Amino acid sequence: DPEFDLLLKAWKSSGLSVGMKDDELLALLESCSYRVERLKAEELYAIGGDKLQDLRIVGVGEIRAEMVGPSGKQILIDTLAVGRILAPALLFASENILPVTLFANEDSVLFRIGKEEFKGMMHKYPTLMENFIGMISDISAFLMKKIHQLSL
Amino acid sequence: DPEFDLLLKAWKSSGLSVGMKDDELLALLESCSYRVERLKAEELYAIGGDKLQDLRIVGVGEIRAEMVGPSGKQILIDTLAVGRILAPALLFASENILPVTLFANEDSVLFRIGKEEFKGMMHKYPTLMENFIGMISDISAFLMKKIHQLSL
């Protein structure tokens, strides 16, 4: 399959596409410029805080992702399959950005979209805007419930 | 060569040089071919399994190193200054090698020496060999004490 069809399959399986017709989703992705990151199975990768300001979607495979605090502990372990977005709540962050660690359970591929380009894509489609905002908002709610779990 | 002087200072401050005559240190290091890995401050890096079979010594800076288990927990957090060896007990390992992650608290430099080269260096100088084996042995003993700590 062409790379573009992998990207479409990942988006249709993503929460970003909910409520969007196939026509406007196709148009959005046909005009999009993206880069490809390939993760070899059973390897560990690190992404610093300064390089988390792009939209990353799992195009192929499955990855165990974790945040790394300032002291060294890895929190928020999560396994992302095709269609999930890597650390979306940190895309538009300007402070307190924790580095991320990724382990490939298979041969995996992430598609990377620039910050400014994704901002334009969100402006053009209000549905994509609300869906991404709801994604990061639900992440915030989950983090708050976890904080209550950890609090004494 | 200034970088070579940094390598020499890192060795003299390392446990590898204990008991060996300064002339032998100079001779050992002048015949050695090495690579230079530079870590930008506040960035996180991952050194995978088979990429761990090289001798790495902290040349400049200070680095927070941690092992990553298969589930994702980070164990054995340690802060290495100039002169420390990074995961020396895994240099000659053949199985059960966990990946490492490294966080630079400053601009840092590690000097990388090949496995084969270090094997030769240790054959030629018995003192360096005994020092490295004492390093690896004390690490094993520390791990055993920690295992007793964590045991039920």
Side-chain angles (χ1 to χ4, degrees), chain A residues 8 30 34 37 42-43 48 68 71 77 89 105 112 114 123 125 129 135-136 140-141 143 145:
Chain A
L8 196 178
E30 281 195 293
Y34 60 94
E37 298 169 346
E42 307 278 283
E43 195 180 324
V68 185
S71 167
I77 311 186
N105 309 331
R112 172 166 95 241
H123 172 51
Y125 301 93
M129 185 193 71
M135 182 176 295
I136 65 190
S140 279
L143 298 183
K145 223 148 196 96

Side-chain angles (χ1 to χ4, degrees), chain A residues 2-20 22-39 41-152:
Chain A
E3 212 96 90
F4 173 86
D5 294 74
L6 282 180
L7 186 35
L8 196 178
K9 190 241 219 167
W11 260 71
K12 250 288 189 210
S13 201
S14 166
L16 298 184
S17 74
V18 180
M20 275 202 296
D22 281 9
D23 293 335
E24 57 185 21
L25 165 54
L26 281 159
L28 166 73
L29 295 188
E30 281 195 293
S31 48
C32 160
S33 148
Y34 60 94
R35 293 191 140 81
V36 180
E37 298 169 346
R38 290 172 197 278
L39 313 200
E42 307 278 283
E43 195 180 324
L44 198 72
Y45 305 87
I47 315 184
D50 311 33
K51 329 293 177 57
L52 269 173
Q53 289 62 3
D54 310 71
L55 182 84
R56 295 212 171 68
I57 175 169
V58 179
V60 175
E62 174 186 281
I63 308 151
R64 156 172 72 76
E66 308 136 330
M67 301 303 144
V68 185
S71 167
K73 176 76 149 319
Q74 294 210 146
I75 62 180
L76 308 162
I77 311 186
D78 190 17
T79 286
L80 317 174
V82 153
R84 297 272 316 287
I85 293 90
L86 164 70
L90 298 195
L91 174 41
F92 293 88
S94 45
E95 54 181 15
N96 289 332
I97 302 112
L98 308 181
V100 62
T101 279
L102 310 150
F103 185 88
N105 309 331
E106 324 164 54
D107 281 351
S108 285
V109 168
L110 303 165
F111 297 123
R112 172 166 95 241
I113 301 183
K115 183 181 188 152
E116 263 274 90
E117 211 171 307
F118 185 58
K119 197 205 156 178
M121 297 181 10
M122 289 182 85
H123 172 51
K124 175 171 170 54
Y125 301 93
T127 291
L128 175 63
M129 185 193 71
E130 190 172 9
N131 283 338
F132 179 79
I133 291 184
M135 182 176 295
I136 65 190
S137 298
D138 287 341
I139 287 163
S140 279
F142 179 86
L143 298 183
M144 292 179 209
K145 223 148 196 96
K146 200 75 173 193
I147 283 178
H148 173 67
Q149 276 169 29
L150 299 174
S151 281
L152 298 324

